[PDB]
From a paper:
To investigate this issue and to clarify the structural determinants of Hia-mediated binding, we determined the structures of two Hia passenger domain fragments: one with adhesive activity (Hia51–166, corresponding to HiaBD2, which shares a 45% sequence identity with HiaBD1), and the other with no adhesive function (Hia307–422, which shares an 18% sequence identity with HiaBD1). The structure of HiaBD2 was determined to a resolution of 2.0 Å, using molecular replacement and HiaBD1 as search model. HiaBD2 contains two well-defined structural domains, namely, IN1 and W1. IN1 is a globular knob-like domain with a simple α/β sandwich fold. The W1 domain of HiaBD2 is an all-β domain consisting of five long β-strands (βW11–βW15). The structures of HiaBD2 and HiaBD1 are very similar, aligning with a root mean square deviation (RMSD) in Cα positions of 1.1 Å between IN1 of HiaBD2 and IN2 of HiaBD1, and 1.5 Å between W1 of HiaBD2 and W5 of HiaBD1 (see superposition of the two structures in Fig. 3a). However, due to the lack of structural information on HiaBD2, it was not clear which residues account for this difference in adhesive activity. The examination of the binding groove described above reveals only one notable difference among functionally important residues between HiaBD1 and HiaBD2 in this region, namely, D618 in HiaBD1 corresponds to a glutamine residue in HiaBD2, resulting in a change in charge and a longer side chain. We propose that the distal binding domain (HiaBD2/HsfBD2) initiates the initial interaction with the host cell surface.
In a subset of nontypeable strains, the major nonpilus adhesin is a protein called Hia. Hia contains two homologous binding domains, called HiaBD1 and HiaBD2, that interact with the same host cell receptor. In particular, the Hia passenger domain consists of repeats of structurally similar domains, including five structurally identical Trp-ring domains strung together by two IsNeck domains and two KG domains.
Author numbering:
A (entry chain B): 53 to 96, 100 to 165
B (entry chain A), C (entry chain C): 53 to 165
The structure:
């Protein structure tokens, strides 16, 4: 049948400040985190560990990729499941990569 | 209890190109994505084959990941999959310095000469 | 929905060292791996401890991630844990330029100078 849980995404209404950490409070109000799952929330942990995850939950997993160039402020984007990050080396930066048993190395050199 | 769902991986033979977007088609045919979970598969109706309120399985977790690529100048992208518990090492040599810092889930990789 | 499974985290007790892989071993102590889900732990029958067709939990989701490492030439690796909703910044300074563009979830980070 249907399986559901009460996990919210950052950016959703009814976020409870006293129920979360300051880190999550900061994510709640940032655009870059909007729509990523809020996995933490604490009455002491609201959605218990032993709660079924849903496929909709998986669609909301990710991390935030940012780039800074000098003083210029950070630009941020979400890396969700099956998104791609390309590291591209132009002149005169050489970017090479190896991959052994789940360990991926991106090398940078002149 | 044996919990299952109908989620496929990219590269699976019976993915239907007609019913899905160009973005998904592009992932479906790349070896780089092969075996990653296909979360965004649609039917004729342009609705998701597997609805949000479906049990996720441990098998599903084993197919989560993102694609990591490097491209030098004009040459074509070399790609790998970063799956759960994989490691990505950014290494500086040959005149390039790479350093890192971490604080409260905020990680920084810094590149210098 | 109340649900459980037998998945443990790297760093947890009762890890059968001789029945598991070298990599898992290589991971179960490294601090950067601690608390990350041990997805592929084997049992005494030399099969996966938790089969593919088992419900995943929110507790599992809280343990998903990957390891981000850096190496400055000769020095040792510095490693840190990247979990869901962590941020990773790529910063360029004297005098590497690090710029980024994104389109349809493909993110390009470009290194110049």
């Amino acid at each position: 049948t249907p399986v559901t849980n009460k996990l919210k995404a950052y950016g959703d209404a009814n976020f409870n400040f006293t129920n979360n950490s300051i880190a999550d409070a900061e994510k709640q109000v940032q655009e870059a985190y909007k729509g990523l799952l809020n996995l933490n929330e604490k009455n002491a942990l609201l959605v218990e560990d032993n709660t079924a995850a849903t496929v909709g939950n998986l669609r909301k997993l990710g991390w935030v990729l940012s780039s800074k160039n000098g003083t210029r402020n950070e630009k941020s984007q979400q890396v969700k499941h099956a998104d791609e990050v390309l590291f591209e080396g132009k002149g005169g930066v050489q970017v090479t990569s190896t991959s052994e048993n789940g360990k991926h190395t991106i090398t940078f050199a002149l």
